[PDB]
Amino acid sequence: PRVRRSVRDLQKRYDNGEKKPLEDLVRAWVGIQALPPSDPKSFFALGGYHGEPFQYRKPVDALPQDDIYPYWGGYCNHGNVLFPTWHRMYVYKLEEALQSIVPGVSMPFWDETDEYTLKHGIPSILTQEKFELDGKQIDNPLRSFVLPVALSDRLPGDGNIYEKPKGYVTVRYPLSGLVGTPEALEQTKIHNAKFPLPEKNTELLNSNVRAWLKGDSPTPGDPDPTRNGVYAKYVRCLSAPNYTVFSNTTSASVWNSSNPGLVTPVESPHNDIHLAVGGFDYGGDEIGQIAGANGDMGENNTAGMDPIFFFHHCNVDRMFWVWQKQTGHTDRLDIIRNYPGTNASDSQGPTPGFAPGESLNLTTPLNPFKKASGEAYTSEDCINIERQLGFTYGPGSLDDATPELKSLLAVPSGNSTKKLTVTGIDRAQIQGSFIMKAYASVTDANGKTREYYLGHKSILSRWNVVQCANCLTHLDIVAHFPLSAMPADDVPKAKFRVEFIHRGGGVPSAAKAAIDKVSALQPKFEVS
Amino acid sequence: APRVRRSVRDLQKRYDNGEKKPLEDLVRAWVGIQALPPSDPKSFFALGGYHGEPFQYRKPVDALPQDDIYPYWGGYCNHGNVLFPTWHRMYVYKLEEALQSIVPGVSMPFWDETDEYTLKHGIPSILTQEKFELDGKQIDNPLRSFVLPVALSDRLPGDGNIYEKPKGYVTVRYPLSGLVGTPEALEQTKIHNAKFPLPEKNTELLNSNVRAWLKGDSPTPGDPDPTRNGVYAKYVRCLSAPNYTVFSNTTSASVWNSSNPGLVTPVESPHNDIHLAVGGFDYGGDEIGQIAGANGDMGENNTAGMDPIFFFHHCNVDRMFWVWQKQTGHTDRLDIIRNYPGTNASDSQGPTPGFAPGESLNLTTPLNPFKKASGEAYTSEDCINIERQLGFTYGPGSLDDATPELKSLLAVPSGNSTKKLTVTGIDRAQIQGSFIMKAYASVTDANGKTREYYLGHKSILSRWNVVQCANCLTHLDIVAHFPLSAMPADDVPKAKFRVEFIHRGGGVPSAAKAAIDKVSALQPKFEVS
Numbered sequence A: 001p002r003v004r005r006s007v008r009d010l011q012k013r014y015d016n017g018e019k020k021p022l023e024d025l026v027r028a029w030v031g032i033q034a035l036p037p038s039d040p041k042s043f044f045a046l047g048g049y050h051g052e053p054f055q056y057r058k059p060v061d062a063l064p065q066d067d068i069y070p071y072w073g074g075y076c077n078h079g080n081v082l083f084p085t086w087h088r089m090y091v092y093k094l095e096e097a098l099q100s101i102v103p104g105v106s107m108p109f110w111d112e113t114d115e116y117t118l119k120h121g122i123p124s125i126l127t128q129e130k131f132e133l134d135g136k137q138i139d140n141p142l143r144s145f146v147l148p149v150a151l152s153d154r155l156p157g158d159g160n161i162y163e164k165p166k167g168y169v170t171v172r173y174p175l176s177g178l179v180g181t182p183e184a185l186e187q188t189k190i191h192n193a194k195f196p197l198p199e200k201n202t203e204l205l206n207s208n209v210r211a212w213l214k215g216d217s218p219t220p221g222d223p224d225p226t227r228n229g230v231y232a233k234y235v236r237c238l239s240a241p242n243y244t245v246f247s248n249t250t251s252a253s254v255w256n257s258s259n260p261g262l263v264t265p266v267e268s269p270h271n272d273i274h275l276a277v278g279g280f281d282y283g284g285d286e287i288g289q290i291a292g293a294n295g296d297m298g299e300n301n302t303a304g305m306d307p308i309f310f311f312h313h314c315n316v317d318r319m320f321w322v323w324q325k326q327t328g329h330t331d332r333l334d335i336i337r338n339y340p341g342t343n344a345s346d347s348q349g350p351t352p353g354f355a356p357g358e359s360l361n362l363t364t365p366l367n368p369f370k371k372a373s374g375e376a377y378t379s380e381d382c383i384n385i386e387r388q389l390g391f392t393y394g395p396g397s398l399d400d401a402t403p404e405l406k407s408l409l410a411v412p413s414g415n416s417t418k419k420l421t422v423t424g425i426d427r428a429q430i431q432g433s434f435i436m437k438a439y440a441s442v443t444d445a446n447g448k449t450r451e452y453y454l455g456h457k458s459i460l461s462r463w464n465v466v467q468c469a470n471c472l473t474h475l476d477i478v479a480h481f482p483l484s485a486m487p488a489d490d491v492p493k494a495k496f497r498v499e500f501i502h503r504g505g506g507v508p509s510a511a512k513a514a515i516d517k518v519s520a521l522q523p524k525f526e527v528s
Numbered sequence B: 001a002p003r004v005r006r007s008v009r010d011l012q013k014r015y016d017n018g019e020k021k022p023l024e025d026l027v028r029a030w031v032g033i034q035a036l037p038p039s040d041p042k043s044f045f046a047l048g049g050y051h052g053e054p055f056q057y058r059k060p061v062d063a064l065p066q067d068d069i070y071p072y073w074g075g076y077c078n079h080g081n082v083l084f085p086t087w088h089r090m091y092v093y094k095l096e097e098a099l100q101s102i103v104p105g106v107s108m109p110f111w112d113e114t115d116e117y118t119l120k121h122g123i124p125s126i127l128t129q130e131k132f133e134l135d136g137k138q139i140d141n142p143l144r145s146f147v148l149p150v151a152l153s154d155r156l157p158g159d160g161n162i163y164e165k166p167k168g169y170v171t172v173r174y175p176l177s178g179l180v181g182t183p184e185a186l187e188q189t190k191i192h193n194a195k196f197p198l199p200e201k202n203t204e205l206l207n208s209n210v211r212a213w214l215k216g217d218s219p220t221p222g223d224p225d226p227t228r229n230g231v232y233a234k235y236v237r238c239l240s241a242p243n244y245t246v247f248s249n250t251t252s253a254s255v256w257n258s259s260n261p262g263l264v265t266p267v268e269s270p271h272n273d274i275h276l277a278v279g280g281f282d283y284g285g286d287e288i289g290q291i292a293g294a295n296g297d298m299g300e301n302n303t304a305g306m307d308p309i310f311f312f313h314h315c316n317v318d319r320m321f322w323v324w325q326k327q328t329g330h331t332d333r334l335d336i337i338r339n340y341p342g343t344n345a346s347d348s349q350g351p352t353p354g355f356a357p358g359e360s361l362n363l364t365t366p367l368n369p370f371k372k373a374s375g376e377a378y379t380s381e382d383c384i385n386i387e388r389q390l391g392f393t394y395g396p397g398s399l400d401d402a403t404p405e406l407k408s409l410l411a412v413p414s415g416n417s418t419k420k421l422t423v424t425g426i427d428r429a430q431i432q433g434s435f436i437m438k439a440y441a442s443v444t445d446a447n448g449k450t451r452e453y454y455l456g457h458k459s460i461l462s463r464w465n466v467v468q469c470a471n472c473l474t475h476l477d478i479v480a481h482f483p484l485s486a487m488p489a490d491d492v493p494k495a496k497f498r499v500e501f502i503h504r505g506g507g508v509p510s511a512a513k514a515a516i517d518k519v520s521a522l523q524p525k526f527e528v529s
Ligand SMILES: [Cu+2]
Pocket: A050, A076, A077, A078, A087, A300
């Protein structure tokens, strides 16, 4: 049974004399990036499966505003119960291509919650410019990917924000990569000119990733993860009561509207990391509403084209394995039938070959992945990673439940165990990912006022190219926040607010309308 | 001074003892409403029309390939969503307003489907009777059926479909059939209805079928004796629904029953059963075959609205809503679990006109096409309290008290199973018309011999569809829950379960063979909780 390890581990081993592990990893990645785009083991093909390049439903795209519905032209499952197992298979399938080059090689995980990441950000092997392979200096293949062919719909006369030219290089925070219209490219050029130094950019990113994990501005001593950060949310997720609500944000959201307390699906901190690496400043609501760093990882469209997507998803799979171990679901999973999250119409809408209204279950095929026999993989094929897929997860953060982790999530004596529901944000238009941050102020009769931060919600979403003015996806926003930061007697005095950080329509001609709508929103606040 | 909606059976008792001015007012009002011209939004044609047909279409959705198409509803009524109880509340209210425009002050009464009369004798004859004595001349009874004053027609050149019904079409109930819009359908309807030429006999068959439904078995003489499986038991169970969301509709109740121990019955469920009883399904149909050929107006949502008994039945559904409102403390407040199945326009029948696929339904959303004095759309907010907001109440009637009897009818007998059966493995079914599922269990002991248990019924009240590919019908995943309270707890793990279907056979002889084969080829999947 092969072991997948912490990549920080492979890097320490490299710096201490033992280099074949990191060198094997790099060699295999060089190998798959060099395969041609038409080869289904090429990194371009593999990154392609997630999102773009898309398959369209032209009859749906022409529907009027009252009849149109959202769908997904990529194969990835998001906001549904196939989120964990589809990505499980996806990483496994890219490991298979790596093995094409270097037999027996294992895909490590970026351990997002280890001590190194809390204190120093992303392991440098994922950001370094260069690497020593066969005593030669090569370009580090994990830093980014150059597109061998264009992402293009090849429609004569047309260019949209989905499209990226041949030679396009993937980018992370703080850079922008939306280049398919003249407007987006121009704004991208202006935005990137504000971040011209690669070394400074790497620092900015490491600092944002630490701030996301912490849940507040990074401290220079020991890490001190608060209850609101991505550390806390990954911990909370290992307590999800059942697979259905562990698995996705649609299921967990309705569970949290219908049951006491709060569950966190693994998809939730996973969304957090996307936005962190992919262009959102945790502190962004102290500055403005618009996150202009349109990086590949920040939306599902081209996230799969960035190598770090697989190191991150390797850690997401890890967390799913750990949840399986700690809750005894190593061999069997269950789905609440017809629960929100089990429908192809949920969230991103249906993937290719699915229809509106169609159920999703453990037998549903995880396209486009196929076995040696040519038969479609299903969730049944990949529940026990040791038994059916032939690999395990080495040791890393969070794999044991402990007193320290229990006291992190726990309500300070005399603080509210209640929860806040934010709604009244009905039928908002979706262009790109966005974040919500909730706060509370309380004012005494004597006039003193305290301020409370209640936490964040990351909606990982997509770019959308539509055929009419008002034909974007509509979404009801619903968000639940703990009140644990507040003392219980302040809750009835409280005045709540939310701040959004969003894409502003993707381009400058869409920005003022986006800002006006968000500023106009009058959310409803409900205390349990 | 809240007006009093009464039992129509009570109004007939009083007519027979010489107090005739209440039932004469009702009938007078229904005559006046049926004689208004069709363009008048108070004409029974327009009121009946609001529920379903005449349809508003979404021509670009009708044109979609089979992978992209989705169901939608061209009528205004809400079914399988949280607006079912409140939309229909306002529909009955608005019909009542129309009646009042003909006879000031009149109250729309309710067919008490669960009183001792209905259990023993079926429908009160005031609703089935051919004739009625008003102002000296004996008139046609407007409550027994309705004549269309204009066609239900899409007026398309060269086309005719099962939605369409000619001017002069008369609504029908079990045992008659009423699909007439293609030649095959009209032929079958003529042949079928000619087997049933006597009105008196037809009424007896209807009353017998209604009584069978209510009971859960063949109607027995004397003490009606409802079982745990009948529509009586189901209405009783719906008053224990833990919240409004799952009380309100079949979609919410279904997901609840998949995700909580025990069994909830929404009010829409017994309501569905009455529709099918009156609109063409024989409770004991599964002893005869799979097809229910009596295509009555009440049996599908398409034209049910045009049969006057719709409003007597729904007046009782509203009463049951009120009774649940009374017994659970929601006379003044309702709430909806946010994003729960049943809170989306995409659910069940699909979006009504105006609405968009993923759009949410709450106590705020307009109950089209109903409108107050101020031209502003009604909402559920406007009709939570019937006493304070609408100025009417429900007089006494069956089931309005919790009662030892009711308890030990739904009670699990001693040693019998408290477990639940879940029926599954029936995915992507094509829907043409309403259908019924009936669940059974056999148990062979070691001594070779076999017992049979009836576990109950599930009515899917649905719709006739007209589509533009063979493969393009609405697809439904069928999930059903049945109690095992009928069988002894130690018989359960030995049990071999089965379901039978009674369905419309595609509506026409030419679709019947295909439909029978598809059903016979289902391999349902069974699970015990
Ligand atoms: Cu993904």
